[PDB]
Design a protein around this ligand. Structure first.
Ligand SMILES: Nc1ncnc2c1ncn2[C@@H]1O[C@H](COP(=O)(O)OP(=O)(O)OP(=O)(O)O)[C@@H](O)[C@H]1O
Ligand SMILES: [Mg+2]
Ligand SMILES: [Mg+2]
Lengths: 160, 149, 317, 648, 99, 345
């Protein structure tokens, strides 16, 4: 049909979505095809791209003692979102629980990152896992103590 | 001696109470007594009473014939009663009658013992009082306040 | 202090005025100048007392008498006093302001006011006095050498190079050549049509000397008028000879080292009576003394704790 | 524009013949042939930009305003004004409101008829401009503005009576009674002890006594009046007993109580760090869901983000002028933040921001420059009176002064090392000649290194290809606001009045209070610079130096400014032939129309390279070079005020 | 309020609250006090009241929690360090009729 | 804590892509086990089972280790890093060590003690190999900071031009003209500046005086194709083949194929294309192009599709930092998928 460059206006995210496939998908027909696509849509003047449109300085911000937990927490939570967790839920949550156990009450700073995803995981996931997640939720609860109060509604909804 | 909390326990961090909780009980009883009334499930049956209304209760703590003074006057009667029906006579005299300020503190301390309970604290006193939190004259106060606001 | 035929004095940012001696360099005595620094000194022309052009205030200390604080205080100049001069008889002092106003100050009669003024555009750097005591030469920070007649009230402006702050000036005791020196690093020589009885007072442009790379800061002729010494901000004091205008001598206080990030500039110089020794001041605490023939450091007057800007050097009987 | 340039040939070429009865009528014959087809034409090029016509629209104004007192330009203007989309004029309202009081009869009535139309459609857009016009001093403004607000009340009374109240409450918050008393008293003490002036000292104080005669309107004013309303009443009594007797023995009793509250209030203001809005202004706390839009948000092509509710308490920045950090929950939900300033006329800022609007337009339409992201970082400014206004706060920014301070303390560098070197060498640094001070300046440059900005611009970037873009943008940006800054003539650019975007890297100037060489002529520390291109900022560019990105970006900019000089004049003539700003230039000595014409002479000069040498015509590379030399010369830099920070 | 205003004010309010229950007493409030400050204060109140009862209200939300050693926390002159204060020392300075 | 680490440090007896990557994998995981911080130790368990967990913590993991280790142990490690960069340019081992090296500069820990400069010269080389031009410039300027030379400036104007930053290149030239007023060997400089006519003058002069060199010709050929001149470039190829080596002929033949293709001389093109190595993108491309003139689509389609699979790495190295640099590779795939449309046309 000859629908070219125009797709970078209409559904403009497209370039970011395609250039992940070249840096992820382990097939030299899929990685092969993703090039056939990019080509056929054509190249963009990077100014046209900037119209159509952390991790290192994550060290830069902090002293090192606080750095390490923050990095791990970010990597863990980047997995902690459906597709990769289909196998590796349990692993992630075992790490987190060990992190908070290790930190003391300085763990509290990570709460708003973890907790919203965490509770949504419980509702979403299969019952194969679910009895484990509650064991570990209760573990988070214990280290954090009273600071969990903001999320308590959601927890009670989950339990109920 | 008078002490906010037991040796184990930590004081409450609860956003709507003051951080001064044991002092405020001891020396502004009516002000927290009313605010603490408002935070219970008791208020389910006093509709149209918010914390804003309790800010502006008219009267003062000396003019007996004005809602604030009335509650204050009641309060005094109640705490003095809870002490006189609980403590042995010698001890009651020592604390509640000998001198003004101590008597005022221990009267009010009874209120603290009742409140701070509901937030996992227990106050402590050097002449050790018995537990008065359950004593039925409190449920009189509860009604008295209810009507009076 | 007064008794020595070579009175040398020196000062800058250390608040002291130190009195050296020529042969040895044992410090005779020192005097305080608090509240300020010293922009330039001069001795009065009968060796009687010495001037210290401060910020807001000239003061004058006794050279003959032993250990005083100032005899005379003049204020009434609401910025720096950037130069002085003196009437060779010893009645007047011809000052220059940072406030664009080259005054006259009577020495004998006490009067806190000035006798005359000569207002121009920019701040007044140099105030040098022509030998017959009738003309006064005032430069400034916009190129402009104004020649001001003290008798007739005439003022004839004169721009050698556009805009560049002409930093200092002097005219020889012969009245044959005048030299003023600018911030570009050029020393401009002017031929005198010597206006004695006529007031012709015309100048004929002789030579632009590529004198220095950086700021030239003070130029002076010797009493011989064979030699024109030009101090600078390349830590140098290049002596020029009168006939050619060729580099006869090049004094330098450079390091002799690939890394020495400005030891300090070569501020002000002043010849001897015979013009064989040339003193100089510097911004590394060292008032020196040289040999004009060769360029050999005959003495070194190191006593100041902070920097030094101005000299006061004196041959006369 | 051929017809417009032909018009300006026989205007300017005739004043050459004329100045240096019937020569104005022959002119009025010759001009009129072209003046009218210029106007007719522009209307078609405005109706075929429709989204990009600020340049074109300002051309129509230059014509209307100046050659509209003819009836035959009036005719074509009238016709076009009825034809053109009423959207278009929104972009040029400041120019229109500035001439709302025209002594020309026929022009002024057409303006009204246009503003009353913009008042009909897009009312939001107008009311804040009109409200500051409304409470003017001069008669033909405040009659005509209050007139249009009356004619604009029966479209939208609900809208105006909101917006007018909001406005008048925001000003009660912007300065509190005890501030007004503190600044009033300190100025009063300068008059009677410095100058010895007594009648002018009453002129200072008694408008505050007239303020306090109204009585406590809000809780904080109640607590002023209860704390010290009495003292001030009594000091007023004694200063009024001076006006019948004329003894200094009255006055000593008054200055007792005046210094009394002065010292008390001076001991209070350091701790007023945040203002609980109930105490200061209850109407705004009470305010929920105004139809009136969030200030400096209104777009004719967007739906209105309206004031859902004002935030309950205000953070107070500590400076000379103690600005508030006011914030509004808009009806889209989002906290919008402002900064609400007392004692500064922000109509300069308003117009200057309009100018950058023009420049960004010009630079974006040259394709060579478009590519390069030459874009001035303009924020929003909404005046509320002559004495106050709001200013759109900027996200992801920090003053150089803050960056450098944070870096210096991180790596344990003593903050004022440069100033301390200078003082350790020469203790009397202020009290030196020029040449002496150049010594000391150079010494303290040649012992530190100015890597500080250059270094932290890399430490704070994540990756290198980020850092690269940051620094490329940083340079070009800093050049564009050199050249634009120069023209405007934008004084006092010390390191707390400019700031770095911690994302894009771009620079962003703030505070346009010192404009058109106000700073160049002040009688203590007159600036000698065009723009700060100090060594620190220099080191942060590519290691080669100025000769790449920065110098080449100056030419690129200055080709574009010297090209379209007439657009740039139209915009600047606004706040020059508006009387109510230009008192700023009357204060240069220790009359106005002459002084106002001096500015616009000056700016015509910078845009013709007839700036340095009135006789010569300095072509663009050459003009730029002389400027760079000026800005970077150590004589010029060490004359600057010590807190200007020239050794950064 | 900003720190210093708040602390002074709280001393005023706390005094006003005790004035209801006892309006005829000397109320000597100490605000973020040093050890030596407290010593001067308690001993001074002894010599005034001399045989009769003396209140000692101690708040301590600013300081860390009191130790098993029998030490309660106050400040040093510069406000860097929480200094401790032995209860034994405190009941030395305060008299026997006390609360 | 280090005896298990030592197995993954200098196990650098590696030769193919898979061999070096598997060095990297095992290294990153070996780091995570050790790392003294409990909040990384934790992840190891996961880091095996999901490898991008180790990938992303690599830099962080590395500092947690490196912070502890002995001086002997630091040099032991660094010597295998030196060797990992030096021996074998793998996109995803260089771009993980360069990004580790850059991570190390923002740190309190100091930069990596490589080869006495803090490795500036080494790391800059290998950024310019990767087409990591921005990083390449950071280090190139770090050289400049310790006393510049004509060689530094020469490169520094090409690299600025490779970032498409010509005002900065022109600036660097105006540094040169002040301080190195004589040194001015600008035959390569004009060529790097994108002053292609003046470069052709300077290489005309330099090939008149000195002999028929291959290097002067390669530059003077690059001048012609950058001008556009096809007729003249086909002359500069024809004459010099036996005088030229076979190593230079791999560099040369790419320009030659485009030139002969320029002039509709296909027989010549066929000869030159074979000289280009098949495992490169370019070789695959021109083979495919010849095939399209000849009319052999099966073969062509295979070569196209082979080229894509080789291009994978060029698009996988660039775009990991910025799309702007990816843009080079983007034009190639544009051509390829258009190459496909040539068949269909
Ligand atoms: N538009 C803005 N965006 C972000 N920050 C701003 C803005 N305007 C001002 N600020 C910040 O607030 C501070 C004070 O602002 P400003 O300089 O306008 O107030 P001021 O009291 O006039 O200060 P000064 O005494 O320097 O004139 C500045 O140092 C700046 O960091
Ligand atoms: Mg400011
Ligand atoms: Mg300001």
């Amino acid at each position: 049909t000859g629908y070219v460059v125009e797709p970078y206006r209409k559904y403009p995210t497209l370039l970011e979505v395609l250039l992940n496939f070249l840096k992820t998908e382990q097939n030299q027909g899929t990685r092969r095809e993703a090039i056939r696509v990019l080509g056929l849509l054509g190249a963009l003047d990077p100014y046209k791209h900037k119209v159509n449109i952390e991790m290192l300085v994550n060290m830069g911000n902090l002293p090192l003692d606080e750095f390490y937990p923050a990095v791990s927490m970010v990597a863990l939570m980047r997995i902690f979102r459906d597709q990769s967790l289909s196998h590796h839920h349990t692993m992630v949550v075992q790490a987190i629980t060990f992190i908070f156990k290790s930190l003391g009450l300085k763990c509290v700073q990570f709460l708003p990152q973890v907790m919203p995803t965490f509770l949504n995981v419980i509702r979403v996931c299969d019952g194969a896992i679910r009895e484990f997640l509650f064991q570990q939720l209760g573990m988070l609860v214990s280290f954090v103590k009273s600071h969990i109060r903001p999320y308590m509604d959601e927890i009670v909804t989950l339990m109920r | 001696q008078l002490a906010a909390c037991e040796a184990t326990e930590l004081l409450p961090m609860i956003p709507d109470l003051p951080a001064d909780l044991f002092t405020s009980c001891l020396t502004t009883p009516i002000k927290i007594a009313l605010r603490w009334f408002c935070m219970q499930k008791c208020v389910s049956l006093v509709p149209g009473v918010t914390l804003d209304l309790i800010e502006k209760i008219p009267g003062r703590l000396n003019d007996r014939r004005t809602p604030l003074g009335e509650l204050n006057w009641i309060f005094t009667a109640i705490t003095d009663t809870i002490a006189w029906n609980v403590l042995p006579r010698d001890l009651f005299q020592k604390l509640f009658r000998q001198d003004l300020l101590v008597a005022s503190l221990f009267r009010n301390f009874l209120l603290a013992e009742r409140i701070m309970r509901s937030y996992n604290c227990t106050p402590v006193s050097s002449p050790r009082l018995p537990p008065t939190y359950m004593h039925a004259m409190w449920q009189a106060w509860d009604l008295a306040v209810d009507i009076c606001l | 202090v007064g008794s020595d035929p070579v009175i040398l004095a020196t000062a800058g940012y250390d608040h002291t005025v130190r009195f050296w001696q020529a042969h040895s360099g044992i410090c005779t005595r020192t005097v305080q100048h608090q509240d300020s620094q010293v922009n330039a000194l001069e001795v009065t022309p009968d060796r009687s007392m010495i001037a210290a052009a401060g910020y807001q205030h000239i003061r004058m200390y006794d050279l003959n008498s032993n250990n005083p604080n100032p005899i005379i205080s003049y204020d009434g100049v609401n910025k720096n006093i950037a130069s002085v001069g003196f009437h060779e008889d010893g009645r007047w002092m011809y000052t220059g302001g940072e406030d664009c106003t080259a005054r006259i100050w009577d020495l004998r009669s006490r009067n806190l006011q000035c006798q005359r003024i000569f207002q121009v555009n920019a701040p007044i750097n140099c105030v040098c006095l022509h030998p017959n005591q009738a003309e006064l030469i005032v430069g400034d920070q916009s190129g402009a050498i104004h020649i001001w007649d003290l008798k007739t009230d005439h003022n004839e402006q004169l721009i050698p190079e556009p805009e560049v702050s002409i930093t200092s000036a002097h005219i020889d005791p012969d009245a044959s050549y005048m030299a003023a020196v600018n911030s570009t690093g050029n020393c401009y020589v002017w031929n005198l049509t010597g206006g004695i009885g006529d007031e012709v007072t015309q100048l004929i442009p002789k030579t632009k000397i590529p004198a220095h790379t950086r700021y030239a800061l003070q130029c002076r002729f010797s009493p011989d008028s064979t030699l024109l010494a030009t101090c600078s901000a390349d830590q140098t004091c290049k002596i020029w000879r009168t006939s050619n205008f060729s580099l006869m001598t090049e004094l330098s206080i450079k390091s002799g080292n690939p890394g020495e990030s400005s030891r300090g500039w070569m501020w002000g110089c002043a010849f001897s009576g015979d013009s064989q020794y040339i003193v100089t001041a510097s911004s590394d605490n060292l008032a020196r003394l040289w040999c004009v023939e060769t360029g050999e450091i005959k003495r070194e007057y190191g006593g100041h704790q902070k920097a030094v800007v101005c000299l006061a050097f004196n041959d006369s009987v | 524009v051929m017809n417009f340039e032909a018009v300006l040939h026989y205007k300017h070429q005739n004043q050459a013949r004329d100045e240096k009865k019937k020569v104005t009528e022959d002119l009025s014959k010759t001009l009129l042939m072209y003046t009218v087809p210029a106007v007719q034409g522009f209307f078609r090029s405005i109706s075929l930009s429709r989204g990009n016509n600020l340049q074109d629209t300002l051309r129509v104004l230059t014509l209307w305003f100046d050659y509209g007192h003819w009836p035959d330009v009036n005719e074509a203007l009238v016709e076009g004004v009825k034809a053109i989309q009423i959207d278009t004029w929104l972009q040029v309202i400041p120019q229109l409101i500035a001439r709302i009081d025209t002594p020309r009869p026929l022009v002024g009535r057409l303006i009204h008829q246009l503003l009353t139309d913009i008042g009909r459609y897009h009312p939001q857009a107008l009311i804040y401009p009109l409200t500051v016009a409304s409470k003017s001093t001069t008669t033909a403004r405040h009659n005509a503005a209050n007139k249009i607000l009356k004619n604009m009340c029966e479209h939208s009374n609900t809208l105006v009576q909101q917006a007018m109240m909001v406005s008048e409450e925001l000003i009660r918050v912007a300065i509190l009674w005890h501030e007004m008393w503190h600044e009033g008293l300190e100025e009063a003490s300068r008059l009677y002890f410095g100058e010895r002036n007594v009648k002018g000292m009453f002129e200072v104080l008694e408008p505050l006594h007239a303020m306090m005669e109204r009585g406590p309107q809000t809780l904080k004013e109640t607590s002023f009046n209860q704390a010290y309303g009495r003292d001030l009443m009594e000091a007023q009594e004694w200063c009024r007993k001076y006006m019948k007797s004329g003894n200094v023995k009255d006055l000593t009793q008054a200055w007792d109580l005046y210094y009394h509250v002065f010292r008390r209030i001076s001991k209070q203001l350091p701790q007023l760090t945040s203002l609980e809005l109930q105490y200061v202004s209850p109407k705004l706390l009470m305010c929920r869901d105004l139809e009136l839009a969030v200030p400096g948000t209104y777009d004719p092509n967007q739906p209105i983000i309206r004031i859902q509710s004002i935030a309950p308490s205000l953070q107070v920045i500590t400076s000379k002028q103690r600005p508030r950090k006011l914030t509004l929950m808009g009806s889209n939900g989002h906290e919008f933040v402002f900064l609400l300033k007392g004692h500064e006329d922000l109509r300069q800022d308003e117009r200057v921001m309009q100018l950058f609007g023009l420049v960004n337009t010009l630079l974006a339409n040259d394709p060579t420059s478009l590519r390069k992201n030459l874009s001035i970082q303009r924020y929003a400014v909404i005046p509320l009176s002559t004495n106050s206004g709001l200013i759109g706060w900027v996200p992801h920014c920090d003053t150089l002064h803050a960056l450098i301070r944070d870096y210096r303390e991180k790596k344990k560098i003593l903050l004022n090392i440069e100033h301390r070197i200078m003082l350790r060498m020469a203790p009397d640094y202020d009290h030196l000649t020029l040449m002496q001070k150049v010594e000391v300046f150079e010494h303290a440059v040649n012992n530190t290194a100015g890597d500080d900005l250059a270094k932290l611009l890399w430490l704070k970037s994540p990756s290198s290809e980020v850092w690269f873009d940051r620094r490329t943008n940083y340079t070009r940006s800093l050049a564009v606001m050199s050249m634009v800054g120069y023209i405007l003539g934008l004084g006092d650019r010390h390191p707390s009045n400019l700031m770095l975007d911690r994302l894009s890297g771009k620079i962003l100037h703030i505070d346009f209070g010192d404009c058109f060489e106000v700073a160049m002529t002040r009688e203590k520390f007159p600036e000698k610079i065009p723009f700060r291109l100090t060594r620190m900022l220099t080191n942060a560019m590519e290691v080669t130096g100025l000769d790449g990105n920065y110098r080449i970006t100056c030419h690129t900019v200055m080709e574009v400014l010297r090209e379209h000089k007439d657009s740039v004049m139209a915009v600047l003539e606004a706040f020059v032939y508006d009387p109510l700003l230009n008192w700023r230039l009357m204060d240069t000595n220790t009359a106005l129309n002459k002084k106002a014409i001096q500015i616009i002479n000056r700016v015509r000069d910078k845009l013709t390279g007839r700036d340095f040498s009135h006789d010569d015509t300095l072509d663009v590379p050459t003009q730029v070079e002389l400027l760079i030399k000026q800005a970077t010369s150590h004589e010029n830099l060490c004359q600057c005020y010590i807190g200007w920070c020239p050794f950064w | 309020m900003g720190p210093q205003k708040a602390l002074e004010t709280i001393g005023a309010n706390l005094q006003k609250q005790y004035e209801n229950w006892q309006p005829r007493a000397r109320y000597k409030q100490s605000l973020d006090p040093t050890v030596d400050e407290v010593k001067k204060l308690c001993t001074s109140l002894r010599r005034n009241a001399k045989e009769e009862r003396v209140l000692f209200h101690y708040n301590g939300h600013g300081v860390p929690r009191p130790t098993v050693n029998g030490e309660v926390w106050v400040f040093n002159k510069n406000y860097t360090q929480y200094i401790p204060l032995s209860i034994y020392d405190l009941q030395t300075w305060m008299g026997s009729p006390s609360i | 804590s280090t005896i298990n680490l030592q197995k993954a440090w200098g196990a650098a007896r590696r030769v193919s892509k898979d061999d070096w990557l598997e060095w990297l994998r095992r290294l990153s995981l070996e780091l995570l086990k050790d790392s003294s911080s409990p909040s990384l130790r934790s992840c190891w368990a996961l880091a095996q089972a999901y490898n991008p967990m180790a990938r992303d913590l690599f830099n962080a993991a590395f500092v947690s280790c490196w912070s502890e280790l002995n001086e002997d142990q630091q040099d032991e490690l660094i010597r295998s890093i030196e060797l990992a960069l030096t021996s074998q340019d793998i996109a995803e081992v260089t771009q993980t060590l360069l990004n580790l090296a850059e991570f190390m500069e923002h740190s309190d820990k100091g930069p990596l003690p490589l080869r006495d400069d803090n490795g500036i010269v080494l790391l800059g080389e290998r950024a310019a190999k990767c087409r990591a031009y921005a990083k390449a410039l950071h280090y190139k300027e770090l050289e400049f900071q310790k006393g510049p030379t004509p060689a530094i400036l020469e490169s520094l104007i090409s690299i600025n031009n490779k970032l498409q930053q010509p005002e900065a290149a022109a600036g660097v030239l105006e540094y040169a003209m002040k301080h190195f007023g004589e040194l001015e060997i600008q035959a390569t400089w004009y060529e790097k500046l994108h002053e292609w006519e003046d470069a052709l003058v300077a290489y005309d002069k330099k090939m008149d005086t000195n002999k028929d060199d291959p290097e002067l010709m390669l530059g003077r050929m690059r001048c012609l194709e950058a001008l556009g001149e096809w007729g003249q470039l086909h002359q500069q190829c024809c004459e010099k083949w036996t005088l030229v080596n076979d190593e230079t002929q791999a560099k040369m033949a790419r320009m030659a194929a485009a030139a002969a293709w320029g002039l509709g001389q296909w027989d010549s093109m066929e000869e030159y294309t074979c000289m280009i190595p098949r495992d490169t993108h370019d070789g695959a491309f021109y083979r495919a192009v010849l095939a399209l003139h000849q009319d052999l689509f099966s073969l062509a389609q295979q070569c196209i599709d082979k080229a894509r699979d080789l291009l994978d790495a060029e698009l996988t190295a660039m775009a990991g930092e910025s799309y702007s640099r990816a843009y080079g590779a983007m034009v190639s795939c544009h051509m390829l998928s258009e190459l496909e449309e040539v068949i269909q046309y």
